[PDB]
């Protein structure tokens, strides 16, 4: 009857929708796995625990002199030691060459900050006592703004930095 | 057939696809 | 009242609901000022003259998130997911435990509220260490959340008393939904209870010097995903089991509704690394595993879309509507109890699409911590969950108080739900578009008016939304108190039955429902998924603890 016919027709089409749903979600999983096998995956933070003492990071070791923060570690590779703190970034500016692979090693002496580079996929949380490590190659020279996008106290809306990519 | 219910899941499917492929494109443009 | 002597559960349900709506009103006052802020308009000097205890944008944002997303949603869920099953079974809950759960929620709220109002816990509703709040905030919040453990016991008691008196019978549908809901929430809640007892409480009392912020975040987001399913599922229970009757139809499938709820019991908890894609020190392998499980937790909502749309189409055809789109026009658009959840479901389409983007690991680097994320979640909790709760007042309040809704109050209700819906849709455009232009969330951007010149056009949307929602909020306040403070009472409204829908049955149903009625088995499976999804990372983190000192930066 009407009700019983409707119920059978509804469940029949619902089975089709659920198979289609599964198929679509599987295609998204394949397209995500593709990103993980390209250069675009270097913005995923390193899974390794790299512990540091936030009380001494401004006094001793690689964050203590911002003017020696940019270190050549490879023929076309630079490692940059970045401090995110209440409320700014050091060095400022960060100066790097176009076309090289940049390894950012970011930490905090105080609270959690964000490190979001406008125009890029660099978008990483910065935890005190931990090093956030991400990799990016800048294709275009010019000035890129760093935005703090994790609430870090009353100075948060003013916490900006600068990357200068040199030809 | 539940033609009306089919029209709703078509609109839902197109909304998912525009969101997801639009941001996938953005991700490569920024990469 | 003789009705409260026969159904004392009506009075306790009412105290949960009214305390919830009061929290929603106070938290929502900040909303329009935040929307104006994301429009580059600073109205905080005005707000501070009206509420001079407000010291900062960020204290307002803490009050907004705590009162609306933690307090209002919990009290609504405790009201609906204890009362609806009691009424379906026609059985009285343990009233000693029901009143204890209310007093714990009330005392927890009062104790957490004091340091929030005094500017001693400006840490937001996520309270990420090492930002260090006052001990009363963490103690109050813990007591508030532990209220829900009493609610779990109350419903498992109702279910065990029913089963003992009805051997051989499958759990009735609404009781089935409430049991799997409350058991999911038990498993979900452990992350935040562990974070509070092991770390936040001893830290805030000065018994330990520091907290590891990576372990704190990892325990937080164990609870922090499933809590949004905790918010959602009371709205789904009404949408499955009451809305089809209000539309003039029936629920088209009992088993497809039970199956959506079962998939939420299995998949709501083991997925929280989708909040940690941008965190250091978590293996990318595990992030990909949580991404995949997050995409699967979308299936029960994709199923809900079809089962509910098919039920509304059935109702529209019954009421005379013909063609592709005529079933829509035949539905009762004059009934705010029908209109409110249906508009909520329409906004949930783009809301869900945004969530699927967020879940997709590398795509999250585009949107993480931008205005996109608040755009997404206002369509989910601030629209669907909130509108479903506002609509419930047209049938639930008469049932609890015997107070009638006038034709005038009905018409005012229609205006409130349309303006609230339209305001949320306009704000969604503004926030999603600002997020794609790299505007951060959680930011007093109106204090840096030259920082985001690219966002001038979406900013106009955020201003328009702020004004529309301020009007909706003032009309809602007037309507709710018109109803509560009215003198007229008709006790026969208080003894009327709830408008539970009839179901269309098929030959399939018996067999499907038995397999799903093995709640002990499915609970086991849900527990083991949480062990496999969390255990290996947590072993790693607890083996390498790096506690760091607390900061006050407000
Ligand atoms: C109630 C509240 C919420 C629901 C429900 C919700 C659903 C999802 N979310 Fe979410 N979310 C994320 C992923 C998802 C996914 C995959 C889903 C899915 O469950 C959504 C599935 C939904 C569907 C696939 C929609 C089906 C459509 C239906 C059912 C409507 C049908 C319409 C009909 C029938 C009407 C027809 C009628 C007519 C008359 C035509 C992720 C990442 O993966 C983040 C982190 C992002 C970041 O970077 O921080 C996130 C962030 C949040 C935050 C911010 C937390 C914070 O403060 O940091 C909140 C509050 C939140 C709430 C909620 N979220 N979410
Ligand atoms: C009048 C209604 C509302 C308006 C205009 C509004 C507006 C806003 C805006 C613009 C933000 C973003 C602020 C920022 O990131 O700095 C926000 C945050 C938020 N809103 Fe709403 N909102 C309203 C109602 C609600 C409701 C009903 C809920 C939940 C039931 C809710 C939950 C939240 C949450 C959880 C946050 C995020 C808090 C945080 O990041 O710490 N809002 N709201
Ligand atoms: C670009 C993409 C465009 C959008 C994609 C379309 C949406 C996907 C699925 C619709 C559901 C399909 C359901 C088909 C199942 C048919 C069926 O099972 O019906 C047999 C029944 O027995 C007869 O009465
Ligand atoms: C019945 C039919 C069954 C089969 C139908 C299945 C649909 C396949 C979909 C996607 C393919 C994914 C392949 C991944 C290729 C990605 C290419 C890409 O996006 O590369 C651009 C970028 O610029 C690079 O640097
Ligand atoms: C209803 C209320 C909610 C409103 C939501 C509004 C957001 C809509 C869609 C986002 C999809 C992303 C749009 C980006 C398009 C970019 C594109 O297509 O790619 C071109 C280019 O390659 C890139 O760099
Ligand atoms: C400290 C806690 C105060 C203890 C509160 C004692 C009052 C308990 C009375 C009770 O059962 O309250 C339920 C309801 O208010 C009956 O109408
Ligand atoms: C205290 C709150 C009680 C929470 C109890 C949930 C676990 C439980 O008892 O479930 C076992 C299983 O359901 C057996 O039927
Ligand atoms: C209602 C919920 C309230 C829960 C309270 C638990 C309080 C936690 C107390 C745990 C003891 C802490 C302690 O003894 O810390 C000493 C430690 O050895 C230093 O390194
Ligand atoms: C009701 C129970 C209340 C617990 C009362 C506990 C009273 C503890 C007060 C001391 C305290 O918390 O001091 C802060 C600490 O010294 C710096 O973080
Ligand atoms: C069903 C349950 C889920 C089971 C299948 C999920 C896929 C598992 C592993 C892929 C992870 C590969 C991670 C590679 C990332 C490395 C990288 O790009 O480093 C930067
Ligand atoms: C920008 C925001 C966009 C707002 C979209 C709203 C459309 C909602 C669709 C549902 C409206 C149906 C109303 C209807 O059919 O009403 C019948 C009439 O009252 C007597 O027949
Ligand atoms: C041109 C765009 C300019 C910006 C939009 C302005 C905002 C709000 C308009 C007010 C809308 C109020 C609509 C109320 C509809 C209503 O109540 O409809 C009853 C009907 O029975 C169905 O349920
Ligand atoms: C409606 C929202 C559409 C706005 C889409 C902006 C896309 C964007 O930002 O451009 C992509 C990339 O950053 C530049 O190559
Ligand atoms: C209906 C109301 C608004 C529609 C959208 C109005 C958008 C028009 C632009 C408003 C604006 O602020 O102008 C941008 C720019 O600064 C100019 O020079
Ligand atoms: C209708 C739209 C109402 C919103 C109008 C105000 C938008 C706004 O703040 O515009 C600032 C202006 O563009 C600065 O030049
Ligand atoms: Cu640093 Cu916000
Ligand atoms: Cu989540």
DSSP per-residue letters across A87-108: TEEESSSEEEETTSEEEEEEE-
Radius of gyration of chain C (CA): 23
- Which CA distances in Å does C97 have to C20, C64, C185? 19, 30, 18
Helix (H), strand (E) at residue B21: helix B3-29
**CA-nearest residue, atom 5 of ligand 12:** C422
A138 labelled catalytic: no
d(CA C170, CA C300): 22
Helical H runs in C488-518?
Answer: 491-495, 509-516
Q: Which chain B residues have a beta carbon less than 8 Å from that of A41?
A: none
d(CA C305, CA C240): 11
Considering only CA atoms, which of C352, C376, C368 is closest in space to residue C431? Answer: C376
Asked if A121 lies within 8 A of B13 by C-beta distance, the reply is no
User: Considering all CA atoms of chain B, what is the largest pairwise distance in Å, rounded to the nearest integer?
Assistant: 46
**CA-nearest residue, atom 46 of ligand 1:** C358
d(CA A112, CA C129): 8
Q: Which chain A residues have a beta carbon less than 8 Å from that of C254?
A: none
C519-543 and C173-194 helices, crossing angle to 10°: 10
Contact B5, C310 (CB under 8 A): yes
Give the Cβ contact number of residue B29 at 10 Å: 10
C386-401 and C336-358 helices, crossing angle to 10°: 150
A26 labelled catalytic: no
Burial label for C404, CB within 10 Å (0-12, 13-18, 19+), is: middle
Helix (H), strand (E) at residue C296: helix C284-297
- Which CA distances in Å does C322 have to A5, A43, B4? 17, 53, 10
Q: Which two tokens mark C510? A: 């018996």
Asked if B27 lies within 8 A of A9 by C-beta distance, the reply is no
Domain-wise residue ranges, chain A? 2-45, 46-167
Residue linked to tokens 């309040």 = C397
Residue of A nearest to B21 (CA): A28
End-to-end CA gap in chain C: 51
Mutation target for B interface from C353, C364, C368, C429: give the one with most B CBs within 10 A: C353
- Which CA distances in Å does A72 have to A92, A96, A102, A144? 18, 10, 9, 21
Asked if B23 lies within 8 A of C363 by C-beta distance, the reply is yes
Residues 40 through 79 of chain A touching chain C, CB cutoff 8 Å: 40-41, 43-51, 54-55
**By three-state DSSP, how is residue A124 classified?**
strand
Residue C389, CB half-sphere, CA atoms under 13 Å: how many? 32
Burial label for C524, CB within 10 Å (0-12, 13-18, 19+), is: exposed
Q: What residues pair up with C210 in beta bridges, in sequence order?
A: C549
Residue of B nearest to A28 (CA): B20
Q: Which two tokens mark C483? A: 């109803």
Helical H runs in C333-490?
Answer: 336-358, 364-367, 372-377, 386-401, 407-436, 456-484
Helix (H), strand (E) at residue A11: helix A2-36
Task: Confirm or reject contact between A163 and chain C (CB < 8 A).
Answer: no
Instruction: Give me the count of residues in chain A.
Output: 167
- Cβ partners under 8 Å of residue A122, min gap 6: A43, A104, A115, A116, A134, A136, C365
Asked if C306 lies within 8 A of B11 by C-beta distance, the reply is no
Helix (H), strand (E) at residue A73: strand A70-74
**By three-state DSSP, how is residue C55 classified?**
coil
d(CA C181, CA C229): 9
Instruction: Considering the candidates A20, A26, A28, A87, report the single residue annotated as catalytic.
Output: A87
The C-alpha of A10 sits at a distance from chain B's nearest C-alpha, in angstroms, of 6
**CA-nearest residue, atom 9 of ligand 3:** A17
Q: Which two tokens mark C227? A: 């809590």
Class of domain A2-45: mainly alpha
Q: Which atom of ligand 8 is nearest to the CA of C197?
A: 6
- Cβ partners under 8 Å of residue A30, min gap 6: none
Mutate to test the pocket of ligand 12, among C422, C462, C470 (most ligand atoms within 8 A of CB): C422
d(CA C204, CA C196): 10
Contact A76, A100 (CB under 8 A): yes
d(CA A146, CA A149): 9
Tally of domains within chain B:
1
DSSP code for C501: P
Which active-site residues of C does the annotation give? 225, 229, 376-378, 441-442
Burial label for B27, CB within 10 Å (0-12, 13-18, 19+), is: buried
Going by DSSP bridges, is the β-strand pair C210-211/A132-137 parallel, antiparallel, or unpaired? unpaired
Considering only CA atoms, which of A111, A153, A158, A106 is closest in space to residue A132? Answer: A106
Considering only CA atoms, which of A146, A148, A109, A114 is closest in space to residue A130? Answer: A109
Q: Which two tokens mark C471? A: 């009007």
Contact C493, C402 (CB under 8 A): yes
Q: Which two tokens mark C400? A: 């609890």
End-to-end CA gap in chain B: 46
Method: X-ray
Helix (H), strand (E) at residue A163: strand A160-166
Q: Which two tokens mark B24? A: 């996938």
Phi, psi of A58 (to 5 degrees): -90, -5
**By three-state DSSP, how is residue C375 classified?**
helix
d(CA C120, CA C554): 9
Contact C431, C347 (CB under 8 A): no
The C-alpha of A118 sits at a distance from chain B's nearest C-alpha, in angstroms, of 9
The C-alpha of B18 sits at a distance from chain A's nearest C-alpha, in angstroms, of 13
Report how many Cβ contacts below 8 Å link chain A to chain C.
193
CA of B19 to the centre of ligand 5 (A): 6
Asked if C306 lies within 8 A of A48 by C-beta distance, the reply is no
CA of B13 to the centre of ligand 3 (A): 12
Asked if A32 lies within 8 A of C360 by C-beta distance, the reply is yes
d(CA C174, CA C306): 20
d(CA C355, CA C364): 10
Contact C335, B15 (CB under 8 A): no
CA of C329 to the centre of ligand 11 (A): 9
Closest-lying ligand to the alpha carbon of C319?
11
Contact C498, C395 (CB under 8 A): yes
d(CA C403, CA C68): 26
Residue linked to tokens 């104790």 = C111
DSSP code for A130: B
Considering only CA atoms, which of C239, C267, C231, C232 is closest in space to residue C359? Answer: C267
CB of residue C90 inside a 6 A radius of ligand 10? no
Touching subunits for chain A (3+ Cβ pairs under 8 A): B, C
A93 cis-preceded (ω within 30 degrees of 0): yes
Sign of CA dihedral C509, C512, C515, C519: negative
Asked if C504 lies within 8 A of A148 by C-beta distance, the reply is no
Burial label for C485, CB within 10 Å (0-12, 13-18, 19+), is: exposed
Query: Each residue of C353-382: b (16+ CB within 10 Å) or e?
Result: bbbbbbbbbbbbbbbbbbbbbbbbbbbbbb
Considering only CA atoms, which of C142, C26, C24, C14 is closest in space to residue C80? Answer: C14
Radius of gyration of chain B (CA): 14
d(CA A159, CA A155): 7
Going by DSSP bridges, is the β-strand pair A160-166/A142-147 parallel, antiparallel, or unpaired? antiparallel
Between B1, B20, B30, which is nearest A13 by CB?
B1
Contact A52, A130 (CB under 8 A): yes
Considering only CA atoms, which of C266, C278, C274, C277 is closest in space to residue C294? Answer: C274
DSSP code for C498: P
Query: Each residue of C47-79: b (16+ CB within 10 Å) or e?
Result: beeeeeebebbbbbbbbbbbbbbbbbbbbbbbb
CATH of domain A46-167: 2.60.40.420
Contact C308, C345 (CB under 8 A): yes
Q: What residues pair up with A145 in beta bridges, in sequence order?
A: A162
d(CA C67, CA C411): 28
Q: Which two tokens mark C359? A: 């879940």
Instruction: Give me the count of residues in chain C.
Output: 554
**CATH fold group of domain C2-549:** Cytochrome C Oxidase; Chain A (1.20.210)
**By three-state DSSP, how is residue C482 classified?**
helix
d(CA C371, CA C435): 4
Q: What residues pair up with A142 in beta bridges, in sequence order?
A: A165
d(CA C159, CA C171): 8
Contact C237, C251 (CB under 8 A): no
Q: Which chain B residues have a beta carbon less than 8 Å from that of C239?
A: none
CA of C389 to the centre of ligand 1 (A): 18
Q: Which atom of ligand 6 is nearest to the CA of C102?
A: 13
The C-alpha of A141 sits at a distance from chain B's nearest C-alpha, in angstroms, of 14
Sign of CA dihedral C339, C469, C49, C71: positive
End-to-end CA gap in chain A: 76
Residue linked to tokens 């089963």 = C163
Contact C120, C62 (CB under 8 A): no
Residue linked to tokens 């930066």 = C553
Mutate to test the pocket of ligand 3, among A20, A21, A23 (most ligand atoms within 8 A of CB): A20
d(CA A129, CA C494): 59
Contact A2, A95 (CB under 8 A): no
Considering only CA atoms, which of C440, C418, C409, C71 is closest in space to residue C227? Answer: C71
- CA angle, C35 as apex, C337 and C61 as ends, to 5°? 95
Considering only CA atoms, which of C85, C249, C271 is closest in space to residue C175? Answer: C85
Which range of residues forms the domain containing residue B28? 1-31
Mutation target for C interface from A149, A156, A160: give the one with most C CBs within 10 A: A149
Helical H runs in C57-170?
Answer: 57-65, 73-89, 95-117, 135-165
Mutate to test the pocket of ligand 8, among C141, C148, C197, C545 (most ligand atoms within 8 A of CB): C197
d(CA A125, CA A112): 7
d(CA C331, CA C346): 15
DSSP code for C440: B
d(CA C390, CA C24): 11
**By three-state DSSP, how is residue C274 classified?**
helix
Asked if C280 lies within 8 A of A147 by C-beta distance, the reply is no
Q: Which chain C residues have a beta carbon less than 8 Å from that of B7?
A: 324-325
Touching subunits for chain C (3+ Cβ pairs under 8 A): A, B
- CA angle, C328 as apex, A20 and A9 as ends, to 5°? 40
Asked if C365 lies within 8 A of A132 by C-beta distance, the reply is no
Resolution in A: 2.0
d(CA C8, CA C83): 11
Q: Which two tokens mark C319? A: 């009421």
The C-alpha torsion from A11 through A12 and A16 to A18, rounded to 10°, is 20
């Amino acid at each position: 009857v009407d009700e019983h016919k409707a119920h059978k027709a509804i469940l029949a089409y619902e089975k089709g929708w659920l198979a289609f749903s599964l198929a679509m979600l599987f295609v998204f999983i394949a397209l995500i796995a593709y990103t993980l096998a390209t250069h675009t995956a270097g913005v995923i933070p390193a899974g390794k625990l790299e512990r540091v003492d936030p009380t001494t990071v401004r006094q001793e070791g690689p964050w203590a002199d911002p003017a020696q923060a940019v270190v050549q570690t490879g023929p076309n590779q630079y490692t940059v030691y970045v401090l995110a703190f209440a409320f700014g970034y050091q060095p400022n500016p960060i100066e790097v060459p176009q076309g090289a692979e940049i390894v950012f090693k970011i930490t905090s002496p105080d609270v959690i900050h964000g490190f979001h580079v406008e125009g890029t996929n660099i978008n990483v949380e910065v935890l005190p006592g931990e090093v956030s490590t991400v990799r990016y190659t800048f294709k275009r020279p010019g000035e890129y703004r760093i935005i703090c996008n994790q609430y870090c106290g009353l100075g948060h809306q003013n916490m900006f930095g600068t990357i200068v990519v040199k030809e | 057939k539940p033609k009306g219910a089919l029209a709703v899941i078509l609109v839902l499917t197109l909304t998912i696809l525009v969101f997801w492929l639009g941001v996938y494109a953005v991700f490569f443009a920024r990469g | 009242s003789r009705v409260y002597e026969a159904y004392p559960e009506k009075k306790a349900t009412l105290y949960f609901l009214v305390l919830g709506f009061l929290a929603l009103i106070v938290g929502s006052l900040f909303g329009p000022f935040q929307a104006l802020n994301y429009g580059n308009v600073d109205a905080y000097p005005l707000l501070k003259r009206l509420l001079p205890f407000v010291q900062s944008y960020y204290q307002g944002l803490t009050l907004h998130g705590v009162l609306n997303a933690i307090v209002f949603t919990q009290l609504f869920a405790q009201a609906i997911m204890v009362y609806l099953p009691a009424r379906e079974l026609n059985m009285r809950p343990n009233m000693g435990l029901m009143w204890l759960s209310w007093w714990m929620a009330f005392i927890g709220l009062v104790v957490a509220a004091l340091p929030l109002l005094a500017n001693e816990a400006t840490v937001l509703y996520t309270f990420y260490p090492p930002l260090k709040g006052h001990w009363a905030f963490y103690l109050g919040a813990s007591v508030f959340v532990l209220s829900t453990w009493v609610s779990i016991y109350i419903v498992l008691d109702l279910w065990r008393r029913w089963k003992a008196a009805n051997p051989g019978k499958v759990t009735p549908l609404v009781t089935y939904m409430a049991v799997v809901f409350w058991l999911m929430w038990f498993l979900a809640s452990l992350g935040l209870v562990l974070e509070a007892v092991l770390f936040l409480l001893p830290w805030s009392f000065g018994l330990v010097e520091g907290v590891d912020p990576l372990v704190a975040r990892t325990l937080f987001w164990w609870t922090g995903h499933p809590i949004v399913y905790f918010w959602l599922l009371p709205a789904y229970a009404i949408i499955y089991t009451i809305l089809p009757k209000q539309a003039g139809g029936k629920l088209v499938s009992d088993p497809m509704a039970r199956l959506a709820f079962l998939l939420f019991l299995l998949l709501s908890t083991p997925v929280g690394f989708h909040h940690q894609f941008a965190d250091p020190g978590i293996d990318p392998t595990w992030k990909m595993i949580h991404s995949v499980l997050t995409l699967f937790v979308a299936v029960p909502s994709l199923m809900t879309a079809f089962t509910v749309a098919a039920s509304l189409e059935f109702a529209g055809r019954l009421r005379g509507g013909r063609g592709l789109f005529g079933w829509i026009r035949a539905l009762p658009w004059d009934n705010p109890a029908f209109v409110a959840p249906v508009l909520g479901l329409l906004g949930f389409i783009p809301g869900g699409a945004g969530g699927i983007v967020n879940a997709s690991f590398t795509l999250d680097y585009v949107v993480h911590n931008t205005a996109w994320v608040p755009g997404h979640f206002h369509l989910q909790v601030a629209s669907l969950v909130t509108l479903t709760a506002m609509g419930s007042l047209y049938w639930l309040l008469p049932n609890l108080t015997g107070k009638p809704i006038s034709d005038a109050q009905r018409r005012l209700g229609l205006a409130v739900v349309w303006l609230w819906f339209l305001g949320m849709m306009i704000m969604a455009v503004g926030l999603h578009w600002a997020g794609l232009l790299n505007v951060p969330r959680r930011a007093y951007i109106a204090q840096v008016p030259d920082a985001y010149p690219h966002a001038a056009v979406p900013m106009v949307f955020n201003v328009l939304a702020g004004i529309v929602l301020l009007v909706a909020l003032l009309l809602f306040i007037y309507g709710l108190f018109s109803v509560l403070l009215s003198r007229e009472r008709k006790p026969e409204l208080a003894e009327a039955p709830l408008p539970f829908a009839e179901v269309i049955s098929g030959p399939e149903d018996r067999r499907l429902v038995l397999a799903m009625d093995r709640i002990g088995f499915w609970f086991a499976v849900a527990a083991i998924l949480v062990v496999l999804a969390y255990g290996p990372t947590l072993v790693q983190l607890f083996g390498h603890l790096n506690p760091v000192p607390g900061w006050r930066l407000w």
